Design an enzyme around this catalytic site. Structure first.
Site, mmCIF file in Angstrom:
data_model
loop_
_atom_site.group_PDB
_atom_site.id
_atom_site.type_symbol
_atom_site.label_atom_id
_atom_site.label_comp_id
_atom_site.label_asym_id
_atom_site.label_seq_id
_atom_site.Cartn_x
_atom_site.Cartn_y
_atom_site.Cartn_z
ATOM 1 N N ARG A 1 -2.935 8.273 -16.985
ATOM 2 C CA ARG A 1 -3.439 6.759 -16.504
ATOM 3 C C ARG A 1 -4.276 6.142 -17.320
ATOM 4 O O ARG A 1 -4.001 5.061 -17.665
ATOM 5 C CB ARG A 1 -4.246 6.934 -15.155
ATOM 6 C CG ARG A 1 -4.817 5.466 -14.565
ATOM 7 C CD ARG A 1 -5.567 5.625 -13.221
ATOM 8 N NE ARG A 1 -6.012 4.338 -12.719
ATOM 9 C CZ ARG A 1 -7.044 4.327 -12.067
ATOM 10 N NH1 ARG A 1 -7.496 5.607 -11.475
ATOM 11 N NH2 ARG A 1 -7.462 3.182 -11.791
ATOM 12 N N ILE B 1 -11.885 2.325 -9.311
ATOM 13 C CA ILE B 1 -12.136 2.884 -7.894
ATOM 14 C C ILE B 1 -10.971 1.930 -6.990
ATOM 15 O O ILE B 1 -10.348 2.211 -6.221
ATOM 16 C CB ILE B 1 -13.450 2.984 -7.401
ATOM 17 C CG1 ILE B 1 -14.126 3.760 -8.184
ATOM 18 C CG2 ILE B 1 -13.411 3.593 -5.885
ATOM 19 C CD1 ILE B 1 -13.499 5.080 -8.955
ATOM 20 N N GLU C 1 -35.154 10.198 -17.743
ATOM 21 C CA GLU C 1 -34.614 11.582 -18.373
ATOM 22 C C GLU C 1 -33.017 11.920 -18.570
ATOM 23 O O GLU C 1 -32.843 12.698 -19.498
ATOM 24 C CB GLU C 1 -35.397 12.703 -17.743
ATOM 25 C CG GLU C 1 -37.001 12.629 -17.499
ATOM 26 C CD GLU C 1 -37.790 11.958 -16.519
ATOM 27 O OE1 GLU C 1 -37.214 11.367 -15.770
ATOM 28 O OE2 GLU C 1 -38.990 12.378 -16.543
ATOM 29 N N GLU D 1 -7.539 2.333 -7.318
ATOM 30 C CA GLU D 1 -7.262 3.801 -6.638
ATOM 31 C C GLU D 1 -7.300 3.555 -5.151
ATOM 32 O O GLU D 1 -6.225 3.955 -4.510
ATOM 33 C CB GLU D 1 -8.333 4.902 -6.914
ATOM 34 C CG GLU D 1 -8.571 5.037 -8.311
ATOM 35 C CD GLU D 1 -9.698 6.126 -8.540
ATOM 36 O OE1 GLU D 1 -10.709 6.295 -7.749
ATOM 37 O OE2 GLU D 1 -9.622 6.881 -9.525
HETATM 38 C C1 LIG Z 1 -11.927 8.116 -17.045
HETATM 39 C C2 LIG Z 1 -11.298 9.081 -17.570
HETATM 40 C C3 LIG Z 1 -9.979 9.123 -17.407
HETATM 41 C C4 LIG Z 1 -9.126 10.090 -18.359
HETATM 42 N N1 LIG Z 1 -7.921 9.785 -18.291
HETATM 43 C C5 LIG Z 1 -7.144 10.628 -19.308
HETATM 44 C C6 LIG Z 1 -5.575 10.285 -19.353
HETATM 45 O O1 LIG Z 1 -5.106 9.873 -18.380
HETATM 46 N N2 LIG Z 1 -5.107 10.821 -20.198
HETATM 47 C C7 LIG Z 1 -5.827 11.741 -21.256
HETATM 48 O O2 LIG Z 1 -5.420 12.099 -22.331
HETATM 49 N N3 LIG Z 1 -6.939 12.131 -21.276
HETATM 50 C C8 LIG Z 1 -7.825 11.425 -20.333
HETATM 51 N N4 LIG Z 1 -9.153 11.564 -20.160
HETATM 52 C C9 LIG Z 1 -9.862 12.732 -21.162
HETATM 53 C C10 LIG Z 1 -9.590 14.165 -20.263
HETATM 54 O O3 LIG Z 1 -10.475 14.121 -19.178
HETATM 55 C C11 LIG Z 1 -9.781 15.323 -21.094
HETATM 56 O O4 LIG Z 1 -11.295 15.434 -21.666
HETATM 57 C C12 LIG Z 1 -8.792 15.446 -22.431
HETATM 58 O O5 LIG Z 1 -7.380 15.132 -22.110
HETATM 59 C C13 LIG Z 1 -9.141 16.749 -23.285
HETATM 60 O O6 LIG Z 1 -8.448 16.376 -24.568
HETATM 61 P P1 LIG Z 1 -8.615 17.444 -25.987
HETATM 62 O O7 LIG Z 1 -7.476 18.295 -25.430
HETATM 63 O O8 LIG Z 1 -8.234 16.447 -27.005
HETATM 64 O O9 LIG Z 1 -9.969 17.917 -25.685
HETATM 65 P P2 LIG Z 1 -10.505 19.225 -25.130
HETATM 66 O O10 LIG Z 1 -10.269 19.401 -23.553
HETATM 67 O O11 LIG Z 1 -11.764 19.486 -25.507
HETATM 68 O O12 LIG Z 1 -9.992 20.532 -25.674
HETATM 69 C C14 LIG Z 1 -9.709 20.779 -27.158
HETATM 70 C C15 LIG Z 1 -8.924 21.974 -27.407
HETATM 71 O O13 LIG Z 1 -8.743 22.339 -28.669
HETATM 72 C C16 LIG Z 1 -8.635 23.743 -29.041
HETATM 73 N N5 LIG Z 1 -9.099 23.805 -30.714
HETATM 74 C C17 LIG Z 1 -10.499 23.679 -31.101
HETATM 75 N N6 LIG Z 1 -10.553 23.751 -32.223
HETATM 76 C C18 LIG Z 1 -9.191 24.076 -32.742
HETATM 77 C C19 LIG Z 1 -8.905 24.267 -34.032
HETATM 78 N N7 LIG Z 1 -9.776 24.439 -34.995
HETATM 79 N N8 LIG Z 1 -7.544 24.742 -34.071
HETATM 80 C C20 LIG Z 1 -7.000 24.773 -32.835
HETATM 81 N N9 LIG Z 1 -7.227 24.656 -31.771
HETATM 82 C C21 LIG Z 1 -8.585 24.270 -31.589
HETATM 83 C C22 LIG Z 1 -10.001 24.261 -27.926
HETATM 84 O O14 LIG Z 1 -10.017 25.477 -28.060
HETATM 85 C C23 LIG Z 1 -9.341 23.379 -26.764
HETATM 86 O O15 LIG Z 1 -8.310 23.952 -26.372
HETATM 87 C C24 LIG Z 1 -9.848 10.768 -19.540
HETATM 88 C C25 LIG Z 1 -11.320 10.653 -19.421
HETATM 89 C C26 LIG Z 1 -12.110 9.749 -18.662
HETATM 90 C C27 LIG Z 1 -13.595 9.517 -18.895
HETATM 91 C C1 LIG Z 2 -22.122 8.979 -12.018
HETATM 92 C C2 LIG Z 2 -20.940 8.537 -11.393
HETATM 93 N N1 LIG Z 2 -20.910 7.874 -10.364
HETATM 94 C C3 LIG Z 2 -19.406 7.684 -9.515
HETATM 95 C C4 LIG Z 2 -18.423 7.829 -10.546
HETATM 96 C C5 LIG Z 2 -17.079 7.570 -9.900
HETATM 97 N N2 LIG Z 2 -16.438 6.374 -10.843
HETATM 98 C C6 LIG Z 2 -15.620 6.519 -11.534
HETATM 99 S S1 LIG Z 2 -15.193 4.961 -12.434
HETATM 100 C C7 LIG Z 2 -16.058 4.241 -11.178
HETATM 101 C C8 LIG Z 2 -16.113 2.683 -11.315
HETATM 102 C C9 LIG Z 2 -16.458 2.199 -12.759
HETATM 103 O O1 LIG Z 2 -17.275 0.842 -12.548
HETATM 104 P P1 LIG Z 2 -17.652 -0.166 -13.618
HETATM 105 O O2 LIG Z 2 -18.528 0.704 -14.812
HETATM 106 O O3 LIG Z 2 -18.159 -1.084 -13.247
HETATM 107 O O4 LIG Z 2 -16.220 -0.263 -14.414
HETATM 108 P P2 LIG Z 2 -14.929 -1.181 -14.106
HETATM 109 O O5 LIG Z 2 -13.738 -0.199 -13.545
HETATM 110 O O6 LIG Z 2 -15.160 -2.146 -13.124
HETATM 111 O O7 LIG Z 2 -14.540 -1.559 -15.301
HETATM 112 C C10 LIG Z 2 -16.790 5.104 -10.528
HETATM 113 C C11 LIG Z 2 -17.667 4.579 -9.441
HETATM 114 C C12 LIG Z 2 -18.740 8.598 -11.719
HETATM 115 N N3 LIG Z 2 -17.503 9.203 -12.430
HETATM 116 N N4 LIG Z 2 -19.816 8.945 -12.207
#
Ligand SMILES: Cc1cc2nc3c(=O)[nH]c(=O)nc-3n(C[C@H](O)[C@H](O)[C@H](O)COP(=O)(O)OP(=O)(O)OC[C@H]3O[C@@H](n4cnc5c(N)ncnc54)[C@H](O)[C@@H]3O)c2cc1C
Ligand SMILES: Cc1ncc(C[n+]2csc(CCOP(=O)(O)OP(=O)(O)O)c2C)c(N)n1
Ligand SMILES: Cc1cc2nc3c(=O)[nH]c(=O)nc-3n(C[C@H](O)[C@H](O)[C@H](O)COP(=O)(O)OP(=O)(O)OC[C@H]3O[C@@H](n4cnc5c(N)ncnc54)[C@H](O)[C@@H]3O)c2cc1C
Ligand SMILES: Cc1cc2nc3c(=O)[nH]c(=O)nc-3n(C[C@H](O)[C@H](O)[C@H](O)COP(=O)(O)OP(=O)(O)OC[C@H]3O[C@@H](n4cnc5c(N)ncnc54)[C@H](O)[C@@H]3O)c2cc1C
Ligand SMILES: Cc1ncc(C[n+]2csc(CCOP(=O)(O)OP(=O)(O)O)c2C)c(N)n1
Ligand SMILES: Cc1ncc(C[n+]2csc(CCOP(=O)(O)OP(=O)(O)O)c2C)c(N)n1
Ligand SMILES: [Mg+2]
Ligand SMILES: [Mg+2]
Ligand SMILES: [Mg+2]
Lengths: 585, 585, 585
Positions: free
Chosen positions: C256, C472, C51, C475
């Site tokens: 990062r 990880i 689900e 890290e």
């Molecule tokens: C493993 C992982 C690591 C990450 N590492 C990084 C990293 O190192 N660096 C990085 O950059 N990101 C990283 N991210 C993504 C991060 O967590 C955030 O989700 C991201 O930085 C948010 O980007 P954003 O500002 O584009 O979006 P959002 O957080 O969605 O913000 C959107 C913004 O735009 C505004 N807005 C919406 N519509 C309009 C409009 N029409 N006109 C003007 N304003 C508007 C909204 O109100 C809000 O303020 C990572 C994600 C993952 C999964």
């Molecule tokens: C459901 C969930 N569990 C744990 C984490 C923590 N976490 C973030 S990245 C990561 C390891 C990523 O492993 P993998 O998918 O094998 O990618 P790799 O870095 O090896 O390329 C973990 C455990 C998470 N964000 N989500």
């Protein structure tokens, strides 16, 4: 053949022995009000002026009797007004059932007037928290709520849609399981843990028995074990009264709502027997830092070793275990520790007596309570509010095991004086009831002085007017850098408040006025309620937790100032008596 | 260089223009009290006698001014006492910040005195609900709470451990984003949807404009569109006053806190323009069942088509859209529908006037409000409580757009009269303020009459003593089978209550006593607060939702009894005027 | 005349344009399944194997289309499984409706099988969270839920007792408000604020424009502003692709999952225009500690001045505001800052290309992404999982405005690669859809590779098998004092997994194998899903946040070990380029 669901519900309450219940009507709870109307000769509905007084009184019912307290409130603001009463019951672990009104099923989730999803509101405080959705199951859902509130000693909340109590259900399909309810016959304490506990208590040079309300039934055992083995006795504030206050080795409670002998003895004790206690200050005040052995007896597994590293913890009933220790010990002769503590208690009680015994001039809380003690009946009940009165009542009221005193012990909500005295007088119409409240606590629930009038409950209400939140001013004096803010306020003349609700009242402010006013109050309270408004001085009570009396710990300047401020010229530190009987400190 | 975190927090509030805040101190919030003490010349702390009055007043601040209202409470019972005020703010969608005390980080989760996990308590009511765990981030967390309360028009709650406000943080690392706050310049309504809406409104034979407080700024447009196109105007109860009450085609509100013309017209109308409205009764009363076209204008997407199947819904600002309809229409001559509704309104207002104008004998609520109207200043503010006074105030108070009136609109908590008048007089010291409360609503927050005295707020308090929960008695009369229970109670003499808090007061109970007492009250309120206790009869107000006046719908027996009971002998049904102007029913 | 409630609920979903929904049947949701069976020609149910995949695909629908995602689960375990998908929708602010099964109203609160009060489980994630208690209002409650999830851009959860969908309600009574639906109003820019912003932007020596996905509809204006004013561009990782990656002055993202030019540039910048950006790392990485002027543009007031003290804040649509700036400016000539940054971007891209173009050897992540790029179509959609693959896809994929890429941006749940790809092929069957997942991420949702086979969704699945949780491990290298734990594990041969679910798969491990394998994959994927298991090395990607390259900040030994480890021998710090164009660092 059929019966209306709301009628079946009032019968489930009648089956569980519910005598009275509190609330205020509203459209969302009118089908339950309708059911109460027909049965008004069997269950007594008490209409209060504010719902938190209803919830607080329901909690006090269970505190006093051990039976489930019941209150209700209409949807939205009727029900959220119950909060301070329901949290008091959760915290003081007593069984309470709250019924909350709700719009009919037909209009729920339609976003109509004063309709909301009420179930999230009660999730934190309640042990059982359900919205009833079917009228045939509603008698079982109410029975379920009562069984769990009793079993888990907590709050059970049922939100009832108003249309379901007016429905017909088959009269034979519901029942109340009141008939199955029972007390457990618990096993006798295992003889080897009792013997192990006793040896360790016998070899202790400076022992203490520190009990809480879990030892409520072990009054005789505690006192005999005290004088047979020469062990001083101390308790938590609510366990005051289990052993009579005049008992010469009762040290009082420890910390701030405390007494000087209890505090000093605890820092010198080498073995503590902690019995049916759950003192919240143990860790944060490092109360047991010098204790060498810590022995514990409690009925609840989750308490074992909780407040300190425990050497021997016996899971058993307090009274059975104390009776079994008593059954294997013999007289010990007076030790230095017994003698020093007895002399210290005498010194303390002489101090409290000189405060109580002033006969003229400016009224202080101390003499108001000596006058309360003079008119008190040997089995009176006291509803005490929260503030400096918990401290002063613990020092001056002379309780015995026939008395009851109640307050909001842990949650400590202000306002509890008036609802607790209403519950007390409903349960015990023949016992003298007192309500001791400070001015800030009494103005929070002042409108319910009218409920005492309306149901003719003869309560003696004593309000201590200091035009301050005294308990907080003193804290600000100790912690705050900048001036006092928010703790001194305008006068409210509570004899005019009481006159407005048509209750007899007096206002006094001189020590010499007390005897007459209290004799008149004792006589009026034979038939009517009465209120005395004692206008008292803003003197700070001696802080038992900040003693500056020992020359080896405090400088002479500090000791002179302490003695001066607190009229404590003749108080001696414990060390004076320790040295005297050949003990060091 | 460094700054104490609590000082930085009071500066973030000062930066957002917070003039005054309410609360009661306690040990768990004393480090914030300390910070307030130093800044007492810039932010005015108002100490209340019960915390729900603080939370309710904070909500009324934002209701009246559009600025965030702030209140606080100590840990446990200080904070749970805020509930009725915080739910009022959530429901009435106005911005409020509540600070909750909490034990220091050092003793949290230790199960010590009045310490609990407080975060679950505020989860339902709050839009933002956080426990601050670090002192350096605490100024940002407070700024975050205010930004979101404003943005989301709701409650933001921060539980603060007492030790963090006394910590030092670098003074340069915090800021308040007050400097970025702004109003949106919204786009002009799309000209084709405005034109489509106008055509449909022009072809309607029996049209209505039904507005709510969203049309607060469109007073002129509503009234001109009314008389240019010959369209009757009706509103929700809180939108009373946007168009002046004397306007001849104002029909009033619909349902129970309602007026006869509004109710009758709605069942005959063929096209309804629903503007900035969210009437909670739409579905459960089937209010729009006979409507042929339903047109709607709202600023919020979630409202569009919510209360009924909408034919044209324009997402836009009410005033801009009304001004644009107005800019493309011309005069229409009086229609039968305009004429019939005007005659009906005259018939109704003559009825209300004969009740108001009785000059001798037993006091009824109607004449107390005629006397209120006589001394009222053209821009007075009214804090109205909850009960029969919402119904009677909506019928008798003659408001204009210079007036404000506030109550608990949706949650509808009793007790709001006194806190709302305190907030009103703090914000507007030069405007005349009235508190209209029934006896049951006024006894719930009666202790805060002392706050009005203490801060010298000249409020005119009028209590309507009927020794009943009148609004509920009438409901029980309509729904309950068994006798009235819980709705009639003991008298409280509120002039003695007011005297106890040292406020001037009068008690009246004869119509002929009114003029003098109200002239004295108008003059005392130039400098001091005053209270009038009007002892009134328990007469049921004419139920606008249960009219028995039409011979084709009610039998003659019913109509005679209705006319008799409600002194409604000269009321005519709408059908009399419809037939008269050549319309059928 | 009557219709079944379950039929009307499905008609409401049809009315709102819902094409497909996800879930697993169960007894408690079988009356909804029944309704769906009848409607299998109009609305399409996608059965998942677990689900949470249903909730993650529902979220991905809304991410890709902007239309509400719909998922369901049965009572108890079915509903709790949805959690990771629903918090992803809350955190990435996208509309999702989740339907939860419940025992029938007769069995509720009887503690029967798999029956519990399910409303508190959903209270934190859901914007709207309700239990339906009546069949006739049930279509309205579903309609209400969709309106609020759209308006509020969050999750709406409705729990439904199984009996209610089988009741007959009048057909005449329900309606869906889908016809009145509108998106929120976009605020207009104040020209004066824009002129001020433009003046500050033009006076900057080292300017940057830093945009997030709020600038989605402004790629043209962003690139044009950059070229005209000679200012470089950098974005949040989700905003990659708004401006084509090949654009010479696009620096990348910071922190990062970053690119070295963005990180270096951000530290030298004096003025940053922050456009529709809510970068979560601002304060914690002290990102803007050197920025002399911070200018912000956002549609949401709760974001203004949130991440840093803002000197000019504009509450307006990003596109409208950027168009306004561009109309006030003229071409500027090349600056040293412009030139320095371009030179740094060429160096960085030349380094990524050298890693990508190795022709023989042990496989690394870098060459696999090069292989994806060679078979990628210009409008391909990338469902990306969470881990090093975000860092690597961000560095090696060349996206244009015609592509789409989705991941769990802020909740960052692993598992999303397979569900996002399923939703994308359902919505865009004419586009090539990739699933780029690490082994840990692919292992958590691997069973739903079978949903792709069962529903014939031609996805190219690429698993990056490093036998580690690489993100990880790196890290732990940086923070942990003791040895690596829980980050290295046993291999799973995903081609045998794919074979088990009857999908075509290949396994590669040497660079030279890639061309043929991806050629075959590209061909198979025209008709069937295909998977490639790329067994890659354990090399750490260059930490763009720990660059040991500049001789004046790091020792020659650190720098050499860094260059050796990351094959970064030819990288130059931005200081080299700054110095070449006469600038300081
Ligand atoms: C493993 C992982 C690591 C990450 N590492 C990084 C990293 O190192 N660096 C990085 O950059 N990101 C990283 N991210 C993504 C991060 O967590 C955030 O989700 C991201 O930085 C948010 O980007 P954003 O500002 O584009 O979006 P959002 O957080 O969605 O913000 C959107 C913004 O735009 C505004 N807005 C919406 N519509 C309009 C409009 N029409 N006109 C003007 N304003 C508007 C909204 O109100 C809000 O303020 C990572 C994600 C993952 C999964
Ligand atoms: C459901 C969930 N569990 C744990 C984490 C923590 N976490 C973030 S990245 C990561 C390891 C990523 O492993 P993998 O998918 O094998 O990618 P790799 O870095 O090896 O390329 C973990 C455990 C998470 N964000 N989500
Ligand atoms: C303003 C204010 C301040 C206060 N200040 C103080 C203060 O300074 N000093 C102070 O002492 N208190 C103070 N209190 C009260 C305090 O907060 C605690 O509630 C109190 O100390 C708890 O006492 P207890 O251990 O007796 O009871 P409880 O906390 O109720 O615990 C009873 C214990 O007995 C155990 N038990 C139950 N039945 C049995 C049985 N039959 N056999 C064995 N074990 C059993 C239970 O399991 C539990 O462990 C104050 C209260 C107020 C209102
Ligand atoms: C005892 C009691 C009983 C009551 N009985 C009744 C009764 O019988 N009859 C009655 O009418 N009310 C009654 N009420 C009040 C009732 O509960 C509702 O709160 C009230 O009807 C809501 O009115 P509203 O639509 O004006 O305002 P709100 O519910 O506040 O809604 C305002 C609407 O305006 C929209 N809006 C806001 N700004 C704009 C703008 N600038 N342009 C366009 N759209 C905008 C909002 O989005 C929202 O849709 C009673 C209250 C009490 C205390
Ligand atoms: C409802 C509530 N609000 C705040 C507190 C905090 N509090 C604890 S003692 C106290 C002051 C008590 O004042 P009062 O009743 O006047 O008595 P005094 O100490 O002056 O004798 C306060 C405000 C509380 N526990 N309950
Ligand atoms: C705190 C609270 N409790 C209960 C209600 C239910 N209620 C609504 S109107 C009403 C009676 C109002 O009585 P009163 O203020 O005396 O005025 P009257 O109608 O008699 O004029 C009640 C109890 C409420 N809304 N708020
Ligand atoms: Mg006091
Ligand atoms: Mg009344
Ligand atoms: Mg991996």
């Amino acid at each position: 053949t059929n019966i209306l669901a709301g009628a079946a519900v009032i019968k489930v309450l009648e089956a569980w022995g519910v005598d009275h219940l509190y609330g205020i009507p509203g459209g969302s709870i009118n089908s339950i009000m309708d059911a109460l109307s027909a049965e008004r000769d069997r269950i007594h509905y008490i209409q209060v002026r504010h719902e938190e007084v209803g919830a607080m009184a329901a909690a006090a019912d269970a505190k006093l009797t051990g039976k489930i307290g019941v209150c209700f409130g209409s949807a939205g603001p009727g029900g959220t007004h119950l909060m301070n009463g329901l949290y008091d019951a959760r915290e003081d672990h007593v069984p309470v059932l709250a019924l909350i009104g709700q719009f009919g099923t037909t209009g729920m989730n339609m976003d109509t007037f004063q309709e909301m999803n009420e179930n999230p509101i009660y999730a934190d405080v309640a042990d059982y928290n359900v919205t009833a959705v079917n009228a045939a199951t509603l008698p079982h859902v109410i029975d379920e709520a009562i069984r769990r509130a009793y079993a888990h000693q907590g709050v059970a909340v049922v939100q009832i849609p108003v249309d379901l109590p007016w429905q017909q259900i088959p009269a034979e399909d519901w029942y109340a399981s009141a008939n199955s309810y029972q007390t457990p016959l618990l096993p006798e304490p295992d003889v080897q843990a009792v013997t192990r506990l006793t040896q360790t208590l016998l070899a202790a040079e400076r022992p203490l028995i520190y009990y809480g309300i879990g030892a409520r039934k072990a009054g005789k055992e505690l006192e005999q074990l005290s004088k047979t083995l020469k062990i001083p006795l101390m308790s938590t504030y609510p366990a005051k009264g289990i052993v009579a206050d005049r008992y010469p080795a009762y040290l009082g409670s420890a910390n701030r709502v405390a007494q000087k002998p209890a505090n000093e003895a605890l820092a010198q004790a080498d073995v503590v027997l902690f019995v049916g206690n759950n003192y919240p200050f143990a860790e944060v005040s490092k109360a047991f830092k010098n204790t060498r052995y810590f022995l514990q007896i409690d009925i609840d597994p989750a308490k074992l070793g909780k407040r300190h590293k425990t050497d021997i913890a016996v899971l058993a009933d307090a009274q059975k275990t104390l009776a079994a220790i008593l059954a294997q010990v013999s007289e010990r002769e007076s030790t230095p520790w017994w003698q020093a503590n007895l002399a210290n208690v005498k010194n303390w009680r002489a101090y409290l007596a000189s405060l109580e015994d002033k006969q003229e001039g400016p009224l202080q809380a101390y003499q108001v309570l000596r006058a309360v003690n003079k008119i008190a009946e040997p089995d009176a009940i006291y509803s005490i509010d929260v503030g400096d009165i918990n401290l002063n009542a613990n020092r001056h009221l002379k309780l015995t095991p026939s008395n009851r005193h109640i307050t909001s012990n842990l949650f400590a909500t202000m306002g509890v004086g008036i609802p607790g005295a209403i519950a007390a007088k409903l349960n015990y119409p023949e016992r003298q009831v007192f309500n001791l409240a400070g001015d800030g606590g009494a103005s929070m629930t002042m409108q319910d002085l009218a409920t005492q009038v309306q149901y003719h409950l003869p309560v003696i209400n004593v309000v201590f007017t200091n035009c301050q939140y005294g308990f907080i001013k003193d804290e600000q004096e100790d912690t705050n850098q900048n001036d006092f803010i928010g703790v001194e306020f305008n006068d409210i003349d509570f004899s005019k408040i009481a006159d407005g609700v048509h209750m007899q009242a007096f206002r006094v402010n001189k020590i010499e006025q007390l005897p007459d006013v209290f004799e008149q109050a004792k006589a009026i309270a034979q038939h009517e309620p009465v209120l005395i408004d004692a206008v008292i001085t803003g003197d700070r009570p001696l802080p038992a937790e900040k003693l500056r009396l020992d020359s080896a710990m405090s400088s002479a300047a500090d000791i002179e100032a302490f003695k001066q401020r607190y009229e404590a010229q003749d108080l001696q530190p414990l060390s004076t008596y320790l040295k005297q009987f050949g003990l060091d400190d």
